[PDB]
Structures are given as structure tokens and as C-alpha cells.
């Protein structure tokens, strides 16, 4: 099944035409993420590289833009369905839906298995050499070969009580270390400060790649402290995951895992890490900085194993479809658990998905008897003091008539809705995402403020009820005109397929 | 000439393929504009409607959509180019810098001739009757029949010395009178007051429909105080303009105008006006207010007259394409007029034209030893405090490498590239534009602040340089492996015409 194993979604984009396999030579070296890229920005199928320049003992093929978006509006989405086992005609409100489901539900617990396919070949530490395997350079101006960019990170509490699956990035250090990001608030963080102040040994590790889609999906989304995303998984499937355990360490990982590594994250090193072409659209180069460092003990790998890799920057792909999409579904649902009216959330794409849109139950809210100010800052404390909020800068506020999941009306209701100012409350005492150009590279501090709310409703969204129709033909056109019209749109000369 | 005479206007946009004749009656009551505004949010063919249920003794056929966009993005522009004289596949900056070139050229002013087609036929006081005209109904909460949509209001000082053109919404109140709205700080306002304030008559003017399509954009455009737009329409065309004499008045028309009326605006009387689907794309209904009233004396009209009629509100007609593109025309010129390093000026679709982004020659920037905070207020100040800059509300700086007439890259800079609060400057204290919502029906003073300098510009740009590459295809890749990679493009399976 697609959603549970990495091999049969990749047969899975072949038979929707949804792929290109690339047969010759394709030089990691740019080359992959060059062609990566363009497909990101033009929407077109993702990449199978069948034939890596490099690639030794089957490490390894490439698919590029594994979660990235497809160019019919019909199947939009497909690519993301196809995680989660979901029609490819699905929706946004779908596939969050579905990535919420779990969050109501026991967790279903992972099945240990005693092998499976990530076991069918491993090199231990006097046979690889992380600096000889195909690793791609993404962008020119990286600062290291970007081995890890669409696996997860395993990592353990140190009294066994919770397991983190997350996505973060990690470069190639040396033939047997990687560095990457470890930063709050992220559960790869908070893990490994756990063991820091333990203090008596670095973090066992593994780095899982092109593990189960359902599982990556998770691993990109902000689910609670302390929830294992192996049963989150387990409960949104209905399935419970096999896992085998690792060979050097206790740790369990997806059965059929394209590609493992074990070893240790260090609680005391660290070493070069970065720049990075990153989600927001930029490279800094030269702007290295001290990251976590990780030892490699071992590689273990499918027959033929595919690497997936996010070609990340400018519009579309994983950082923006995954990052904002779900971290915008984890802020419907905090929202709606601190009594909050808010129905649909989404990250706009046009904003780099560094706003979120909150869809408002104006109904709900005009029994509330607030105002702006008030019900600004209530949102704004919910969404920009728990993690759930950490990459999002500006949320908007929008009523009922307002589809979050279409860009265009966002940015109607917002140029038209909120005042400048009046209509904002900012924040500058909650934790900012350093990422983001104008902090990390801005004229603040990188680490705290630069977030707003900006409220796009009307005022008598508060009161009475919405005292305006929209100058449009949906709105300003009774319906058996728009009907006639519509239906007689040929037969006068204009120009007239949902698929295609 | 199809910039000189709006028949062959017409009879261009036929032969563009641009347009559809509509032959069949069709029913100005909603009909005509509930077409149109389809076409406007399609981008279809400009709808010529032959056959207008109602039309009496030659009054009237409709075109609507006249300055709407084109589906094709290679002649995106094609409608408003024909207003100019400018080949169809011209660019935005092409438009705006025609639209520019009288600014530093000598008016060439009007030549008076003794007749012309809109003298062909006549109707005095005792023969037309507003009410029974086909005028259209645009929006069904509209609180009249806007007769006027795209036509100009001429008015002249009371010294003679300037003589202006303008657009402006009227409605029909009577057999023979009109409201509509005279709002400072407009120069069909700017010289109501100086009647007013001589005391001793009503105002001479004409509304002329179906004008010199040079004069229609000139119309459209805020250039300066005191500047008579017939000159400026002559040095832009490089062609004095043919005018006649109203039969009772002494006003000046063009020779060729479709319909026009002569008669007085009141320099004591009001009238219920409004409500309208407006530009920012909202009716609040049952909003009505008085407004300027114009008693109507005579109609000449052209045989088998056409009135064009913008159906505004939701992207994309007139409003967005006219008022916004030349506003920041203008604003432009300002600015460069004010020593700022201001290359390029747009105002974003997506902002509902209520921003205007302006790239900066970073080079001067650097030269000037300023800081965000410092050439922000200035920006601001010289924009906000000028008539230019009346509609707009955000002012979005962006340096050299950003696209301002691409509304995705200006969001792009926008959302990644200024921190709110802190990389912004509100003010409060200038005039504000009522007509957008979140003014007129919002939270604070209808008339005053609610506007913004957001200042994209990156810190380096103030000192020593840009000090990223973007994370895209174009930046991120060397030229001969991003020119390999296009080049072999559907060799390998990918997708891949200019026109479409
Ligand atoms: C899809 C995706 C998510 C990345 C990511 C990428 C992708 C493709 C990359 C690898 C291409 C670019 C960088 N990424 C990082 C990242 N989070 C982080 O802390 N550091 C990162 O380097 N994220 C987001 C992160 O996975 C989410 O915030 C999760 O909620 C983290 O899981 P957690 O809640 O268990 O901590
Ligand atoms: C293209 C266009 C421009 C409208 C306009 C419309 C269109 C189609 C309408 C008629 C459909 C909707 C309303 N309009 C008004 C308007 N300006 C104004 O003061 N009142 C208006 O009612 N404008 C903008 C106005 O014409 C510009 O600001 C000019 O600069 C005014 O000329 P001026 O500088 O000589 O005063
Ligand atoms: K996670
Ligand atoms: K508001
Ligand atoms: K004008
Ligand atoms: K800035
Ligand atoms: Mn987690
Ligand atoms: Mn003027």
C-alpha cells in the first residue's frame, strides 16, 4: 500500500503519470536538484533519477519533489493524497482533515517485525563513506551536500516514554558525521536537551529515508509534546506500522525503510553546518554556523534503494505544501481547544507560508460580544505561545464568506478588510522563526517578535452580521441571471475542462 | 485612428479578435453588466451589445469591459495599448511610461473645429428623458442606474485657465439630472470649490462618453494641479486634439464622442447617490449619501451611439487596470521628482490595487547613507501627502532584482522580506481613501490615516550590497547546467507557446 511503504508510492505516482523516470546519467551535483527545482516551479511530474553519476553498491537512486504539487487543479494535491491514501482529487480541507483525524483517537501503538526490506543489504563503519555515496548538492551555494532533506529523525526520550519523528535538515560533515539544525521548539530539540542535562551519553539516533509517506507527513507536522508519531500514524492509517529495530542500536525503524543510518546524536559536539537554500526562498552564502553533529555507525538499505530530496526555495514544494499546510492544521485545531471560533486554517503560498489564514464562525463569534482588539490578541496569545505557531509571522482573520484555502481571496479580504495599524495587534515577546529573511538577516532580533494579527473582519462581523454583498458575479447577479447567462456564455461567442 | 476616435477603438478590438457583438436584445437591467463583469473576472472578449432592450431614437449600445485584461499573457495588456497607439503585446512599463512622456513636454493644446459626429443628432430639455434611456442597472443593490462609468466630466476653473477631465461616478436621479460623487481631494472637487467660493453660479460642465480613448486614460490619471488634460493628451499622442463647443455652453468636447451631455453641477444642490459595486469589489447596501447633482440640458450623440460601461468591482476591470497602474505612474514621477531612487512603480491586483510597490535603484540608495526607518518616513511623506497617492494605503519598497509588475514577486519580497511593525511606518495623519471598506465601514476615521510604508528592503541593501542568491531554477544553478537542463527537457519527459 502506497501510504505505507515508499516503494509501492513511487509505483504509485508512475501509474498516475505523475512520473518521470530519468534512466541516464544525472549528475548529483546540481544536476538532480537543477531539474528538481524547475518541476517545483512549473508544477510538472516528480523525478525518478534511475541513474545517479556515483552511485555504489545500490546507494542510491533519487525522486525528487516527492510532496510537491501537480499542474491540474482537479488533482492539485494528488502527490499529498497519495500519502495518506486518499483520493487524488482530494482536497486541502481533506488532507488536513485527515492529518487531524488521529488527534481525537487512541494511539495504535507500531508492530515490531523481525526483518524487513531496510535490512536487505548494510555497511558498517570500514565500509561506507558518507563523502563517496551520491549525495546531491541542492543548491550551488550550499554549504554542504544535503544528504537529509525528506527522511526523519529518530529520537528517544531518555526514560523510553516518547519517540520523535520529525523532519530536519542534515548535510555531510565527513565519511562518517553529519551536521544539521536541532533548534526550539522542535521535538528533536527538546529530546536532545533531555539528554544533555542527563549528561551521560549522546542521543541513540537513526535517520530513516523514504520511510512510509503517511509517517513523513507526520514527521513535517507540529503534533503535540510528548506524542509518539509512530501511533499518531498508526491511529490516522488504522494500521499499526512494523518497525524493526536497528542493528547497533534500540531504536525501531519502518520495516520497509529505502535507506537507514544509526549512530549517535552528540549532547557535546558540533560542527559546520549551512547555508541552506531554504523554504522561504533564499541563500546566504558564506552565513555558516555551528550545528548539531552526528555520528554514522552504520547504513542499511533496500535493494535499489531510492533517496527522496526536497529541491526547497522559491514556490512549490515540500517546505510549503508540508511545513505550512500542516503546521496550519495543528493552529485550526489549538484554536478550536481554547474555545476559539475558528473553522479552517490554511497557509497562503503567495505568503511564503509565513502567514495563516483563520477562518472565523462569525455566528459563534457575535455571540462572543468582543471586539477586535480583544479577540486579536486572545488568537494572536493561543496561536504565537505554543509551537504549533513557530513558523507562522501573520495570522489573518477572515469570516465565513472566505475560502482560506484559495490565495486570492485572502489577499482580497486582507488589502480590503484590515486596516493597517488599527486593525493589527504586534507582537514582539514570542518566539520567532529565524529562518525567515528579516529576522535571521533583518534589522531585529532574529530569535524573538516580528508577528502580527491582522484582523480582516468587518465590524459588524462582531454585532449584527455582514452588512455587505460582493461586487462580483457570484454575489451581484440574481441566480436564474447568472444561471441564463452561464448557459447561454457560448451560444453568444465566449471562450468556455475540469481535468484537462 | 483607434487612440483618437473611439469608433475605431471598436472597430480595433473587432479586429483584434478581442471583442463579441452581441446582436440579440439584452436586457440593461443586469444583463449587460452581470455579461460583463464575467468577462472581467475571465479575462474574455469585450462584450459590444448591438442590441440593447429599450434603446430609443438611437440611444444607446453598450461596450463594456473597454480597459479590462486579455486571457493570452503576450497580449495581457492588448486593450489598454490600444488606447495609446502602442503595439498589443505591450508591457506594463510601456503603458505607464506613454502615459508618462507629456510629464516634461509641452502641452499641446486643442484645435477647435465647427462640428463633428457627436453633433449628428440633438435632444433638448423637452425631449430626453433619463429615466426612459437604457441606462444600466451594474449591480442589483446599486441604489441607481450608473449612466456613468466610463465617460469624463469636463469642468473648467472659473478664470478659464484649466480645464479638466476626470472620471467620475454619476447615477441618474430624474428625467434630468444626475448624482454622483465630488470628493476631495479630486480636481472635479478642487474646482466645484472654487465655484462655490466665487458664489455666483453652477458649475458649466459636460459629461462626454465614448471619448478619444487617449483621453479616456489621461481621464484615469492623476497628473498634476492646474494641468489641462486635453494638452497632455496632445503631447502624449503628439496631436492636438479636435474639439467642439457644447450647443449651450461654451465647454469644449472631442469632435468624435459617442454620447454627450451638457447642462450644469450645482454649486448648492445634493441628491441621493449610491450605493455602487465599487473597485475594492463590495456594495454595502442601503449605504446612500448625498452627493453632487447635475442637471442635464442637452444630449448630442453620435448616429448609432456606443456607451462604454465598467461593470467594476472583483479583479479584473477598469478600476484595477486605470486607477491603479496610473497612480503609481504617477506616484513614480513624484518620487523621482523628490530625489528618491525610484525606477518602477505597480500597484499589485492582488492588493485590490490598494498598494503600490516601488522598486529602488539600490546602487543611489547605498549612495545616500540612510537608514529603513529614515527613507521609509520620507517615502511616505512625500506619497501620502500628494494627490497621487490618495487610493493607495501600503507603500511596499523592494530593491533591484524584484519584478514590481509581477504581483507574485512583489508578495514574495513583501512576505519574506519586511518584519512587521518594526521594518514599517504607519501615518495617520494624511488623507485616506473612504471607498475602501476597511475606511469608510471600518474602525477608525473614514477620511484619515490607516496607511503604511512596508519596507522590503533588505539591511545590506542600505550599505554594502544584496548578500543572498535566490533559492530558484534562475539563481541557483550556473548558466550552461540550467541551459542543459532546459534544453533537454522533454527529451527526458517533461511538459513544455508564448501567444496561446
Ligand atoms: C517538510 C520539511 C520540513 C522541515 C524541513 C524540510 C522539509 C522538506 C527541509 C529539510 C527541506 C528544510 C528544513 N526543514 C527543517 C524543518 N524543521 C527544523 O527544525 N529544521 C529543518 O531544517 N522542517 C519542519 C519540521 O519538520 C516541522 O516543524 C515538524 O513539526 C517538526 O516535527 P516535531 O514537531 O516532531 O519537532
Ligand atoms: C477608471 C475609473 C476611475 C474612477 C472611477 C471609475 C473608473 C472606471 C468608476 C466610475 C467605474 C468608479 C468610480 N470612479 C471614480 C474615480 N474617482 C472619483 O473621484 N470618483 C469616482 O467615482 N475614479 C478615479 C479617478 O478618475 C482618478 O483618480 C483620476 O486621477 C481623477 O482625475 P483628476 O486627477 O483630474 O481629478
Ligand atoms: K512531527
Ligand atoms: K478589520
Ligand atoms: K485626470
Ligand atoms: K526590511
Ligand atoms: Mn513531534
Ligand atoms: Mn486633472
Redesign the pocket.
Known sequence: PAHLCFRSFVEALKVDNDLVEINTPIDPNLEAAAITRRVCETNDKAPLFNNLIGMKNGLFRILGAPGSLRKSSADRYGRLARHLALPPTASMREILDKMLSASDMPPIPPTIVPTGPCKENSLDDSEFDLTELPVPLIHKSDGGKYI???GMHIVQSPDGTWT??????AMVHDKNHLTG?V?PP???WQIHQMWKKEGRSDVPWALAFGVPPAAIMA?????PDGVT?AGYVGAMTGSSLELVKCDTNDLYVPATCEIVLEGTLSISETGPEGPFGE?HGYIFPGDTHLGAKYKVNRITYRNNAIMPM?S?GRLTD??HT??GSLAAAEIRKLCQQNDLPITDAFAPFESQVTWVALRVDTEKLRAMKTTSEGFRKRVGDVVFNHKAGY?IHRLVLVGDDIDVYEGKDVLWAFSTRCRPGMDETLFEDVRGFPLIPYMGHGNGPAHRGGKVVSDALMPTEYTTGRNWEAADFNQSYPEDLKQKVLDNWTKMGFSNHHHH
Chains 1, 2 share one sequence.
Open positions: 537529509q532533506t525528506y520523535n519523528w520529525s523532519i530536519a535538515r539544525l533548534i522542535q521535538h528533536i514527521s513535517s507536522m507540529p503534533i508519531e523554504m526536497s526547497c515540500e517546505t508540508m511545513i513558523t
